[PDB]
Ligand binder design. Structure first.
Ligand SMILES: O=C(O)c1nc2ccc(I)cc2c2[nH]c3c(Cl)cccc3c12
Length: 342
């Protein structure tokens, strides 16, 4: 009947009203996004004389506390990037309003999945993919600084926003599922398509999980389609194996969940448990179209898509997709890679 004295709906969300004034400061314009956490509204900040995005968290304890974690991490980050040069969304301030935690951010545009839809799921150019890659690796370098040691834990196209729909600048959003290296708590993390092998295998994890996700994202940005589109964990592992082969024995031998996906043979080697291409036969070389005109052959006869360019990109991606989190490429070295040698 009544939710939050009439201010909320039956989904724990604030009922947005165009033109409402809050706290003698914000005039709410319109709803511009929503998700599991709540809503995002465009509002005018009359004190600072600028448009802002306000993320209005659901009035529900689990969502509140998720956002409190997010606020703490954003405050830590923003504090160490006062010039806003490391591609993390800027939290301006926060407040509690009518039993909703509200996070005030800079305005941004839509996400990189919306950009892919805008390409009719045919992909962005290799040059634009490179610009996204360079910004993302720079962000991951900042998150790896020791005072931060932040693992985002949910990198996907939907959590990377354009600043402006006609430009390449991005910001990473949604630190609600994030953690710090000193303070890992979650066993179940990462959205499935972008989930690292160490997490699938129930093994220890660190900031390298975010690099795995980035490798997956960058291929998808150029092809238009997810690299590893599993329907469930077993399918996800099998799709990874089609491209990358059986994981190293030294890893599977230490993996609590190895036998969810694999079986250990009499000779000590590992094979898949019993519909899929044989291990390692779905070549990234062919998914990218390195020698055959890029994805779908559609980049044949276009500049900015040579065999040489594609071989650089393939090499970087394979380093991001190293099964071993100890040897998987780290942000500093990703930035030095020949793919970014203009
Ligand atoms: O702050 C975010 O996690 C955030 N998440 C969103 C989820 C779905 C949609 I649709 C939009 C989201 C979103 N949009 C944002 C804008 Cl426009 C500025 C600053 C942060 C965000 C943000």
């Amino acid at each position: 009947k009544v939710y939050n004295d009439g201010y909320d709906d039956d989904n724990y969300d604030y009922i947005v009203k165009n033109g409402e004034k809050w706290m003698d400061r914000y005039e709410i314009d319109s709803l511009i996004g929503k998700g599991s956490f709540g809503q995002v509204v465009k509002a005018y900040d009359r004190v600072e004389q600028e448009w802002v995005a306000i993320k209005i968290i659901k009035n529900k304890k689990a969502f509140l506390n998720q956002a409190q974690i997010e606020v703490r991490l954003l405050e830590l980050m923003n504090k160490h990037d006062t010039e806003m040069k490391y591609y993390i969304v800027h939290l301006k301030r926060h407040f509690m309003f009518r039993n909703h935690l509200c996070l005030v951010f800079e305005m941004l545009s839509y996400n990189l999945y919306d950009l892919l839809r805008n390409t009719n799921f045919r992909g962005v150019s290799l040059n634009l993919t490179r610009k996204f890659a360079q910004q993302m690796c720079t962000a991951l370098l900042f998150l790896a600084t020791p005072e931060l040691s932040i693992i985002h834990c949910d990198l996907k196209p939907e959590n990377i926003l354009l600043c402006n729909p006609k430009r390449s600048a991005i910001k990473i959003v949604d630190f609600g599922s994030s953690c710090q290296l000193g303070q890992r708590i979650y066993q179940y993390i990462q959205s499935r398509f972008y989930r690292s092998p160490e997490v699938l295998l129930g093994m220890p994890y660190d900031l390298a999980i975010d690099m795995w996700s980035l490798g997956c994202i960058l291929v998808e940005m150029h092809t238009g389609e997810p690299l590893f589109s599993g329907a469930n964990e077993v399918d996800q592992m099998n799709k990874i194996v089609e491209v990358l082969g059986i994981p190293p024995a030294h890893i599977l031998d230490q993996a609590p969940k190895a036998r969810k996906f694999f079986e250990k043979l009499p000779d000590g080697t590992w094979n898949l448990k019993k519909e899929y291409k044989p291990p390692g036969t779905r070549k990234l070389h062919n998914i990218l179209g390195v020698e055959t005109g890029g994805p779908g052959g559609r980049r044949a006869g276009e500049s900015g898509h040579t065999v040489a360019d594609y071989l650089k990109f393939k090499d970087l991606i394979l380093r991001m997709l190293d099964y071993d989190p100890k040897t998987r490429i780290q942000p500093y070295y990703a930035l030095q890679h020949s793919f970014f040698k203009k």
